[PDB]
């Protein structure tokens, strides 16, 4: 089997995709956040605390027939974003572009934090990464693509994000029509659940390429790229007027520059994220100073390719026995 869904960026910024997802039976359609940096499938529901929702679509777990509760289980994540939320559990039958999994773990909120009820766009997250992050007690629960494995053409996801405009998650097979020249396939370590890889190296605009390991996770679920202080530190070197904002909370450059484009390396390829791609506009509605998509990732612990580096990108998941990463350039 395979699948392929349509992926949808919230705001004109590309701060998210979302992603239709059909749960239950009758379908109850809800736009989640694929998030390869997680491994929870959770969603806003009929048990959802009232007064945190706003304006999300919700599943009500009682009007599906193939819904059951998975009893004594519940869940509570909490994100590198400070963002949290909690619940119980129910299977159920859910669909992705047409791939179908019958008794799928569906995390039932019954409370969100005020970022996920200030964003109307967002019903629920679908996490990607590798099981062993799902936070279900006491049993641990399988991802989608974990329960959609066995049943796909061949064991992979591919993410094709795209730069203020729609993209695509397909399932179970690698669109040869959706890149240009070939796929950099990379090692993958998953001692920490993430797609954990390490970049070959970087460079900023037309500069010289610097060959340098960079450890880092391919994180749909983050909107921009967080590298090493020394690295992000070169990049706006090279735009006048940036400065690190610690009253903002990162870099903010002004919004008349234009942008140097930054390269990252996969073995001896090399991705270029245009330099409009790192441009998250005004820091406030009017305001000259505009906030950096390339950030440091000191004090999180970990380099996140987010968004911004993989929208530059074809990316391949390839969860066979031995997972690795493919990037090609599109």
């Given at each position: 089997?395979?699948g392929?869904a349509?992926?949808?960026?919230?705001?004109?910024?590309?701060?998210?995709?979302?992603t239709?997802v059909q749960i239950?039976?009758?379908?109850?359609?809800?736009?989640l956040?694929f998030d390869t940096?997680?491994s929870d499938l959770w969603?806003?529901?009929?048990?959802?605390?009232?007064?945190?929702?706003?304006?999300?679509?919700?599943?009500?777990?009682?009007?599906?027939?193939?819904?059951?509760?998975?009893?004594?289980?519940?869940?509570?994540?909490?994100?590198?974003?400070?963002?949290?939320?909690?619940?119980?559990?129910?299977?159920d039958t859910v669909s992705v572009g047409?791939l179908t999994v019958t008794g799928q773990a569906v995390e039932?909120?019954?409370?969100?934090?005020?970022?996920?009820?200030?964003?109307?766009?967002?019903?629920?997250l679908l996490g990607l990464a590798?099981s062993?992050?799902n936070?279900?007690?006491?049993?641990?629960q399988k991802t989608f693509f974990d329960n959609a494995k066995?049943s796909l053409?061949?064991?992979?996801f591919?993410?094709?994000?795209?730069?203020?405009?729609?993209?695509?998650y397909?399932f179970?097979?690698?669109?040869?029509?959706?890149?240009?020249?070939?796929?950099?396939?990379?090692?993958?370590?998953?001692?920490?659940?993430?797609?954990?890889?390490?970049?070959?190296?970087?460079?900023?605009?037309?500069?010289?390429?610097?060959?340098?390991?960079?450890?880092?996770?391919?994180?749909?679920?983050?909107?921009?790229?967080?590298?090493?202080?020394?690295?992000?530190?070169?990049?706006?070197?090279?735009?006048?007027?940036?400065?690190?904002?610690?009253?903002?909370?990162?870099?903010?450059?002004?919004?008349?520059?234009?942008?140097?484009?930054?390269?990252?390396?996969?073995?001896?390829?090399?991705?270029?994220?245009?330099?409009?791609?790192?441009?998250?506009?005004?820091?406030?509605?009017?305001?000259?100073?505009?906030?950096?998509?390339?950030?440091?990732?000191?004090?999180?612990?970990?380099?996140?390719?987010?968004?911004?580096?993989?929208?530059?990108?074809?990316?391949?998941?390839?969860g066979?026995?031995?997972?690795?990463?493919?990037?090609?350039?599109?």
């Amino acid at each position: 089997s395979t699948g392929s869904a349509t992926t949808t960026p919230i705001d004109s910024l590309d701060d998210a995709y979302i992603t239709p997802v059909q749960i239950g039976t009758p379908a109850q359609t809800l736009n989640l956040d694929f998030d390869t940096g997680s491994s929870d499938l959770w969603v806003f529901s009929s048990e959802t605390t009232a007064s945190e929702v706003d304006g999300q679509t919700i599943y009500t777990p009682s009007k599906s027939t193939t819904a059951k509760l998975l009893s004594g289980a519940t869940w509570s994540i909490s994100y590198g974003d400070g963002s949290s939320s909690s619940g119980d559990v129910y299977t159920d039958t859910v669909s992705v572009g047409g791939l179908t999994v019958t008794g799928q773990a569906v995390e039932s909120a019954k409370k969100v934090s005020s970022s996920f009820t200030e964003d109307s766009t967002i019903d629920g997250l679908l996490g990607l990464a590798f099981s062993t992050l799902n936070t279900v007690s006491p049993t641990q629960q399988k991802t989608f693509f974990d329960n959609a494995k066995a049943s796909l053409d061949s064991p992979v996801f591919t993410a094709d994000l795209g730069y203020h405009a729609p993209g695509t998650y397909n399932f179970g097979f690698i669109d040869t029509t959706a890149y240009t020249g070939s796929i950099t396939y990379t090692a993958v370590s998953t001692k920490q659940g993430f797609w954990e890889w390490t970049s070959t190296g970087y460079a900023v605009g037309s500069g010289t390429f610097k060959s340098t390991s960079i450890d880092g996770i391919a994180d749909t679920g983050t909107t921009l790229l967080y590298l090493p202080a020394t690295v992000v530190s070169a990049y706006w070197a090279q735009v006048s007027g940036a400065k690190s904002s610690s009253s903002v909370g990162g870099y903010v450059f002004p919004c008349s520059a234009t942008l140097p484009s930054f390269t990252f390396g996969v073995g001896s390829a090399r991705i270029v994220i245009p330099g409009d791609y790192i441009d998250f506009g005004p820091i406030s509605t009017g305001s000259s100073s505009c906030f950096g998509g390339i950030q440091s990732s000191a004090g999180i612990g970990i380099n996140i390719f987010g968004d911004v580096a993989l929208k530059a990108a074809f990316v391949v998941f390839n969860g066979a026995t031995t997972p690795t990463l493919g990037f090609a350039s599109k």
